[PDB]
Enzyme design. Sequence first.
Site, PDB file in Angstrom:
ATOM      1  N   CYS C 433       1.361   2.796   2.122  1.00  0.00           N
ATOM      2  CA  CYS C 433       0.662   2.559   0.869  1.00  0.00           C
ATOM      3  C   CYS C 433       0.528   3.843   0.069  1.00  0.00           C
ATOM      4  CB  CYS C 433      -0.717   1.958   1.141  1.00  0.00           C
ATOM      5  SG  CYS C 433      -0.662   0.165   1.365  1.00  0.00           S
ATOM      6  N   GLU C 435      -0.435   6.967   2.177  1.00  0.00           N
ATOM      7  CA  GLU C 435      -0.700   8.004   3.155  1.00  0.00           C
ATOM      8  C   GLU C 435       0.288   9.151   2.950  1.00  0.00           C
ATOM      9  OE1 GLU C 435       0.436   4.540   5.080  1.00  0.00           O
ATOM     10  OE2 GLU C 435      -0.767   4.221   3.264  1.00  0.00           O
TER      11      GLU C 435
HETATM   12  C1  LIG Z   1       0.352  -1.855   4.442  1.00  0.00           C
HETATM   13  N1  LIG Z   1       0.303  -0.873   5.506  1.00  0.00           N
HETATM   14  C2  LIG Z   1       0.273   0.662   4.916  1.00  0.00           C
HETATM   15  C3  LIG Z   1      -0.573   1.338   5.702  1.00  0.00           C
HETATM   16  O1  LIG Z   1       0.104   2.487   6.307  1.00  0.00           O
HETATM   17  C4  LIG Z   1      -1.026   0.387   6.869  1.00  0.00           C
HETATM   18  C5  LIG Z   1      -0.825  -1.009   6.186  1.00  0.00           C
HETATM   19  C6  LIG Z   1      -0.670  -2.132   7.225  1.00  0.00           C
HETATM   20  O2  LIG Z   1       0.328  -2.911   7.167  1.00  0.00           O
HETATM   21  O3  LIG Z   1      -1.576  -2.250   8.093  1.00  0.00           O
END
Ligand SMILES: CN1C[C@H](O)C[C@@H]1C(=O)O
Lengths: 113, 791, 791
Positions: C433, C435
Amino acid sequence: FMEEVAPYWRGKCVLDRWNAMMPEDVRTMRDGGMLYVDKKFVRGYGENTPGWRTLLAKGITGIKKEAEEKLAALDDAHGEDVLKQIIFYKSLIISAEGIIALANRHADLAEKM
Amino acid sequence: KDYMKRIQALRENYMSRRVEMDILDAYYVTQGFKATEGQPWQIQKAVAMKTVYENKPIFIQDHELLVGGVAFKPRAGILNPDSACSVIEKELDTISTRKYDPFYLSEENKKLFMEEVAPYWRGKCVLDRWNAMMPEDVRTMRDGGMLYVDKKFVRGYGENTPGWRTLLAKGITGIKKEAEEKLAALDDAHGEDVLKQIIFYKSLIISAEGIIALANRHADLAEKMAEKEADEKRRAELLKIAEVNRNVPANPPRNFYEALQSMLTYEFCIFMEQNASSYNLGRMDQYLIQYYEKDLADGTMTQDEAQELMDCFWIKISEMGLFQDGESAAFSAGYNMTVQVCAGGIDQYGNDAVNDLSYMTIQATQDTALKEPNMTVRYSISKNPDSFLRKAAECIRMGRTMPAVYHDDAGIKMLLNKGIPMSQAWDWTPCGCVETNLEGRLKSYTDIGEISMGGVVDMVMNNGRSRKTGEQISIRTGDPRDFKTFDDFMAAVKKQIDHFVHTMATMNSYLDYLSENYRPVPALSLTYPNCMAVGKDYANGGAEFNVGNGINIIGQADIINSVADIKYLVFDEKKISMDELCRALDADFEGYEHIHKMCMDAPKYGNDDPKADFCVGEIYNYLVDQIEQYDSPFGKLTAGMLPVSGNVPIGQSVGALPSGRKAWTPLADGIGATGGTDINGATALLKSISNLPHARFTQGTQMNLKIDPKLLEGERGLNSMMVLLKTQCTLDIYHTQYNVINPEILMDAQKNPGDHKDLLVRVAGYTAFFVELGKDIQDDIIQRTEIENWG
Amino acid sequence: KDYMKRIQALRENYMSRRVEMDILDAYYVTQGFKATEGQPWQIQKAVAMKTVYENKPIFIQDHELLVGGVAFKPRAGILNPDSACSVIEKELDTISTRKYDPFYLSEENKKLFMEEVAPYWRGKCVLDRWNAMMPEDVRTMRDGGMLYVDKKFVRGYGENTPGWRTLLAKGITGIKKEAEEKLAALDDAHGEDVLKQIIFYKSLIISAEGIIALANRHADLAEKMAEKEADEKRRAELLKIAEVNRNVPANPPRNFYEALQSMLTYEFCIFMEQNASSYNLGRMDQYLIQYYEKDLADGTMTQDEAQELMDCFWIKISEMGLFQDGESAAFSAGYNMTVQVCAGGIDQYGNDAVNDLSYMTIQATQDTALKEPNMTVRYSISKNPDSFLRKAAECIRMGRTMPAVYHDDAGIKMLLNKGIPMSQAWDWTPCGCVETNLEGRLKSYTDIGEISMGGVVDMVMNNGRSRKTGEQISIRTGDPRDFKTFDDFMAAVKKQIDHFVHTMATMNSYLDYLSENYRPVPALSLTYPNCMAVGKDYANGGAEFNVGNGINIIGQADIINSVADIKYLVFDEKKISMDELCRALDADFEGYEHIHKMCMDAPKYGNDDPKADFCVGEIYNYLVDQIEQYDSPFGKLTAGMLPVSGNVPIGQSVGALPSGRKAWTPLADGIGATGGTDINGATALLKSISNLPHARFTQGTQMNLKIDPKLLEGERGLNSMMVLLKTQCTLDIYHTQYNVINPEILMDAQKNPGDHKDLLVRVAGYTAFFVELGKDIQDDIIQRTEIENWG
Ligand SMILES: CN1C[C@H](O)C[C@@H]1C(=O)O
Ligand SMILES: CN1C[C@H](O)C[C@@H]1C(=O)O
C-alpha cells in the site's frame, strides 16, 4: 642513577603509580603485614615459560619476518584498533632487531678476542 | 529599550578588549598534573581542572549580570598544555603579531610558560605525540598541502552539544551525587575494567567539585564587591549575582536568570577543560522555555529583563576565543570557537518549537551584534511561523551575518544517517560551523581535517606531483594526456580521492588513539547521561551515540568546474588538446590567455548549468562512499563540507586548474560558486548546490551567499529573502548564510580598520570581525559574488 | 497507437475473467511435502514448489507477449496449504458467495481439496498453529474487534521488494550456481549451525531448479503452440515467446523483452511460494532502463514495442488476486495483491532518476486501466521534472486512480529510520500500500495487524468494556466521569494505547516464531544477496537489513476528533458534561440529538484547525514510542498508518464517539479526515495531516483525497493538482492518493455492477475494481469528501 635515571622516572614507573593509586583498605592490610602486595609492582612479569619451540624452530629472524608481514598486511587507515596492532608489531620488530644486535655484538667480541 | 543602555555598555567594554594569551590556566593544569604524578590521566586531568577552577583569576566586569570566564580576561585564549603546549613554545615570540588570529602574550606569561609549563609537557601533550607518531603518507600529504591534519590534535573535542538538559535538570551536584552513587556501587576487587569505571567516576566527581567551586568563588567575589559598592542599584544586582552563582550550576536553576548562569558557568568550564570550537549551546529556546514562562507568569521577571539577560549571555559567550597554532589559524580564522546556539525547529511531538525564546535568541544577536555566539535557526518550513523566518530575514538584512538558516529536515536526515532514531533526531542541534549534534548524546569529532578537492584535481593534472615543489605528493594516476576518454580522467579523479580519503583515515586512527588516551573530558562527561550509565568518558564512547569522526572537504566549485571544464574543453568541444591544457596549466596561464578565457567561459558550477552540474552528484557520492568504508571504535567515518577559512590557505598548495583558477589563489568557499562565476541569481545558485547529496554529509554542508543590500530593502526585499529561504528548504539544501554588506564598507575596513572594529562578516559557517581576519581571508570574502538577482 | 489493439484484446480477456479458487497449487504443495516426510520444512517447501512449478497447468493466452501465472487461470487465488489450509476448509461452501472477495470454488476443486489436501494440513499450517497457540490476551482483544491479528498468519510474507537487480544481472542459474558453490564450500561435519546453512542452500537450489523448470515449460508450450499456428505473425510471437522463456529467468536478460519476462516469471514464482500482497516490482524504470536503451540503440525494439510489452506486463501482474479468509477479506478487499511499481525518484548519484520508462510506467497504467500493478510515483520535488509530475497528474485526472504520489524525501527518511544508510536509502521503493522497502535487501512484515484507534477511544469512554457485548475486553482506565482534567483523560488514552500496543506486540512474538519455523521462502531468498552470504532464509534474518514487524494503526481522524472533541466539549467549552456525554454515547445519540449536533460541530481533524490538530503529534508520537519499545529477533517493531479497508470492518466494533461518529460505522480511512468534516479544501486537509509525524511511521502513512472532477479541467486544473502535490512535499507528507470520479458513476456502479466491471476506485493505498468491493466498503468510499476546493 641519580643524575641520568632517577629524575625521569619519578611518578612514571609502575611502582610509583602503584604507590600513588594504592587504595586505603589495601594500604591498611599491607601496613598491618596481613598481605604482601608490592613485589609484582616492583619486578616485571617473569613467571612464564616463553615459546622456546618457537624461538628454536624460527629463530628471531623468522619471528621478526612474520611480524614484518603481519604489519604489512595491516592498514592504519582501518581505525585505532589496527593502529594498536601496528604498534605492537612495530614493537616486536624493534625489540627483535635489538636481540639480534646483542647476539652479534657477542659474535663481534668473540672474533676480536 | 531601557536594558539596551546596559547592553551597549557591556558591548563597548567587549570591543575595547585586546586579545591576549592566557597562561595561568596552563600553569594550573600543570600544577594539577604534577600534584597527581602516577595517577590515571583521567584523575590527573580532573584534578588539574579543579586546580584551574579553584585558582584561575576571576572577575566581574562593570554592568555584568551574568558572570564568568575561561581565562583571566575577556577574549583571552587559553592554553591546554595537555594538548597544544608546543604551539606556544614554537611561536612564543611570534604569536603576538602572527598573520592570523594573533594573541598578545605578555613577557610575564612567556616566562611563566617557558619556566613552569613548557618543560613538563614536552613529548607529553597530544600535539607532540602526533608529531612523533605521524606516519609518512600523512606527513607527505600534509607537507604538500593536500591535507590539513593538525587541527584536532591542537584543540580538544569541542564539536558537540553538552547535556544542557541534564545540567538544568540535576545541577552539577545532582550529577556528582549520581557519580558518587555509581562509585559506591562499584568494587575495585572486581577487576581492571571496574577500576577503569571507578577512575572515571572519581574523575567525574573531582570535576564536579571543581565546577561548583568556581561558581562559589564568583559568589564570594560578588559578595565582597557588594560590600564595597556605593551604588545601591549595582550593589543589589551584585548580591543577586552572589545568590545566583551560589545556586548554579551546583543546583538546578530556580529561574531564568539562574538557568542562564548555569549554562554559562558550565560552558566556560568545559571550554577551559579543552579549548575547542563548537561547544554548542544548542536549543536554548527549548531548554529555557520552562523558566522564562514560569517567571513571566510569576512576576519575578519581565520579557525585557529576559532579553537583557540573554543579551549579556551573548556577550559573555563572545568573550571566549579559539586559540590555535598559526597554521591552523588560517584554516580557522577570527578566533572562531564558534559556539552555535539555535532557534526554532520542532518539539518532541514534531510540532512547531518556536516560542518567545526563539524570537529573543534572534533578538539577542541583533542587540549585541558580535561575532558570537554563532546564532542560527532550525527552520521547519512545514511548521515554523513566517514571523520567525521573517525576524531571521530582518536580522540578516541588518548585516548581523546571522542567523544561518538550516532546513530542519535536512538536519534531521543527517542525524538519522548518523544512526540516531527519529524519536531523538527531531532534537538535533547544528554544531560549530554547520555540523550536526544532539544534546548530551552524540559523540564525534565533526572535523578531523581537510581534504583539498582542488588538490585532487591538481594531482590528476600533474600526475601526483606538487606544482609548487615538484615532489611526488600523491599517487601516480597517470599522465593526463594518456586519458583517451573523459572516463579515464574520471577514473584518475577517483583514484586520487581514494588516496586523499585513505590518508585522512590513516590520520583518524592516530587521532582516535591519542584522544582516547590523552583527552578525557570529565567536566563534559558530566552532562552526557549515558556516560554515567556505562562509566566511560565521552572520549571513550560513553555517550549514547558515537559516530566516526568527520572528514572535511574543501573546494566544491574547484573540483566541479575542473571536471566539467575538462570534459567540456578537452573531451566534448575539443577546444584544446590535453597537452595544451596541461601546458597552460603549468604556465599558470601566463602566455596562454586565450586558453584561460576558454577555461573561464566553460561551464561554471552555480548557474543551474547542466554542463557544469552533471558531475556534482557522482563526485560527491563517490567521495562520501570512500569516507564511509573506514571503521573506527566510534563507527564509520563521516563527511562534511565546512571549509571554514581553510579554502584560502589550502589553495596556496593548488596550482592553476582547468576551471580557470590561477595558481595559489583560494579555493571556493563552502559548497557554492567560485567568486564571480555565478551570474544567474541566487535561486540558480541554490539549484546548483542542491546537486550535492547533502544528507550524505552528516557533518554538515556550509553554503555562503552575499546579497546586494538593495535586494533586501522594503517588505518586498524581505519577502524575497523568505522566498529564497523557503526555496532552500524545497531544494533540500541543508544550510545557507548571508553576507549583506555595502561592498565599500569592506574595502574601507581594509584601509581604516580602526573605524570598523565591530564590522561582522560571515566567513564559513561562522561570523568574524572583518578587521580581525588575515588579509587573504578578507580578500576571499571581498571577491565573493555580490548576488544581484533573486531568481 | 497500433499496439493498443493487442492491449485492448489482452485487456478484454482480463476484464471477462471469472475469479476462481485454485487448488492444484495446494494439491501439488501437499504432494511435495508428502514426498519429503522427515525432511526440514525448508527442503519440503522447496520441493513442494518445484512440484508446483513443474506440474501446475500453464497457459499462453491469445495476444500475450509475456506469459505465466500463479494458478490454473488468470485471477485465481491460490492456497498455500502450509499457511492457510484450514480457511478453505471452514469456508469450503461459503467462499464462492462470501461478502468480500468471493472465489468460485468448483465442486471438483472442493473434492480434490478435501480428500488430498485438507487432511494433511490440519494442525500443521501456520494458521492452525496460531489458533492453537494464540494467547488469551490476543483472543479477547481480537474478539471484540480492538485488534485485527489474523492477516499475516494467513498470507505469507509479501510486503517486500525482491532483489530484482540480482535476478536481472545473474539469472536464476547464476544464483543457483552461487548457492551450489556456497554449498560445496560448507562441510556438514562442522555442526548443527552449518547443516542449517546447508539445508538453506539446498532449498535455494531446489527452488531455483523449479523456476527454470517452469520457464522452460512455457518455452516448450510456446513451441508446440507455434507448430499449430497458421498466422505467421502469431506463430512468430510464439517462437519469440519460446526463445525468451528458454533464457530468462534462468540467465540474465539479453534484451528488454527478456528482462520483463524475467521479473514476471520470478514474480509469479514468489507469489506461488506464498500467497501474499506486495511482492513489489519496485523501480522498474531503473532496473530495466539499460535494456530499453540498448535495445533501442540496436533497432531490436522501438519505444512503442517497449510500451506494448510493459502494458502486457501490467496485465499479467493484474492476473494475481490475493487470497485470504472471509474476515481478512473485509480488511483488504478487492483481491488486492498490491504489487507496487514506482517511477521517479533519484538515482545512486542523487540525480533525477526520471527516464523514458518512468513515463512509460505511467503510460502503461493509463493504457491498461486495471487495478494492478499499484503504480506509484516517487516524486523528488528538488529533482524530478515537472513534465513527469504533469504526466502523473494527467493519469490521475483520467480516473486511473494512480499513481499515488510519494514525497521522495519522506520515503528516504523512513528507510533511514529503519536503519538503512543514506548510501542505500535513495533506493527506497514504496511497498504494498504505502510501506517502505529496499530492493532485495530489507526484511519485515510491514503490517501484521491493526490497532483500532477508534477502539482505543471507545475503551476509555467505556472503561475497557465492549459496547457491543458488554464484556471486559480491554484494561480498566477509569470511569471517564472521574477525569478531572483533559490530562487524566489523555493519560487514560495513553494507558489504553499501551495495552493495545502491548497486545499487538504479543501477537508479533507468535508471528515471528511461526514465520521463522514454518514460513521459509526459498524462491524469495534467491534474490536476497545477503541470504546467500550468510546462508539464512529471508525468514530467518538472511536479508541485509531486518526491522521488526509493522503494527498498523486505524482510526486516525476518529481518535483525533474524539480526543479533540472531548477536550473542546467537556473541558474547554464545558458545554456538555462527561456524564451527559457518556449517556449520549451509550445511547448512540438516540434521543440526544442536541449532543450529537454539538459533537458534529466540535473541531474536526482535517480542517487545519488547531482546536482539533493540537493533539495529533502527541498521541501519535506516544503511539510509535510504545510500538518502538518492543524488540524482536529482527529489531524494534515498526509502525504504519495504512488501514487498507479495515476501517470498515474494525468500525463495526466501535460504538459512537465524542467526535460525533455513530456506533459501528466505519472509522476514518487512512490518515485524512472523516467524510464530510474536512470543509476547508485540500490544502488545509494536507496541513492537518502534516501534523502526523510521518517519519516515525517507517511502514508508511496512507492519505486519500477525492477531488471534484470539475477541479481538474484544462491546463489550470492540472496546474492546481501539481501545486497540491508540491504542497504535499513542502509539508513533508509521505503519501497522497487521488480518487477523481463523478459521484453518480459510483452510485450507478452500485445499481448496475455489470455496466462498470472495470470502474477503478482508489481505496486505501491501492486500487480495487469498485464493483468487486463489499457494499459497505463502497459506501465508505462514496461518503468520502469530494474536495471542491484546492486551497
Ligand atoms: C494490502 N496489503 C498491503 C499491506 O502491505 C498489507 C495489506 C494486506 O493485504 O494485508
Ligand atoms: C570552527 N570549527 C567549526 C567546526 O567544528 C569546524 C571548525 C574547526 O574545528 O576548525
